[PDB]
Ligand binder design. Structure first.
Ligand SMILES: *C(=O)c1cnc2ccccc2n1
Ligand SMILES: *C(=O)c1cnc2ccccc2n1
Ligand SMILES: [Co+2]
Ligand SMILES: [Co+2]
Ligand SMILES: [Co+2]
Lengths: 8, 10
DNA sequence: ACGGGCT
DNA sequence: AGCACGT
């Protein structure tokens, strides 16, 4: 849910 | 980080 | 369920 | 070389 590197 | 030492993130 | 981004 | 995240 987070997008810190993927943002799923 | 930073840059340097993106972000995090981006 | 998913890996990004320059000094 | 340097960084952990949640819908
Ligand atoms: C987003 O909130 C979130 C939480 N857990 C995960 C586990 C694995 C892949 C993606 C995820 N995204
Ligand atoms: C983004 O590519 C990425 C990779 N690993 C992580 C670990 C913990 C929090 C966030 C992250 N983001
Ligand atoms: Co991973
Ligand atoms: Co990466
Ligand atoms: Co989690």
């Amino acid at each position: 849910x987070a997008x810190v590197x993927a943002x799923v | 980080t930073x840059p340097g030492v993106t972000x995090p993130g981006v």
